[PDB]
């Protein structure tokens, strides 16, 4: 659980599902979870690509696994197992 390259895309999308569905966190779970997120996506944007977009950017679970997704290859940094 370690970098983003120990997550498949199915597996981090679960992740991205979870974070953006009030109710299925607590808030000491959520804390953690977007913690982790930030970590894992070494984005610095952190958890605001969750709650503070900017206009016209996808901000569905699989357009914000896109969006990583896409910075991150962009940058040369690894991306997803598979």
Request: proline share 4%.
């Amino acid at each position: 659980k370690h970098s983003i390259s120990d997550y498949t895309e199915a597996e981090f999308l679960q992740l991205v599902t979870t974070i953006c569905d009030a109710e299925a966190t607590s808030e000491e779970e959520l804390d953690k979870l977007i913690t982790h997120f930030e970590e894992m996506t070494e984005h610095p944007s952190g958890s605001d690509l969750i709650y503070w977009p900017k206009e016209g950017d996808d901000d569905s679970p699989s357009g914000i696994v896109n969006t990583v997704k896409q910075w991150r290859a962009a940058n040369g940094k690894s991306g997803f197992k598979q």
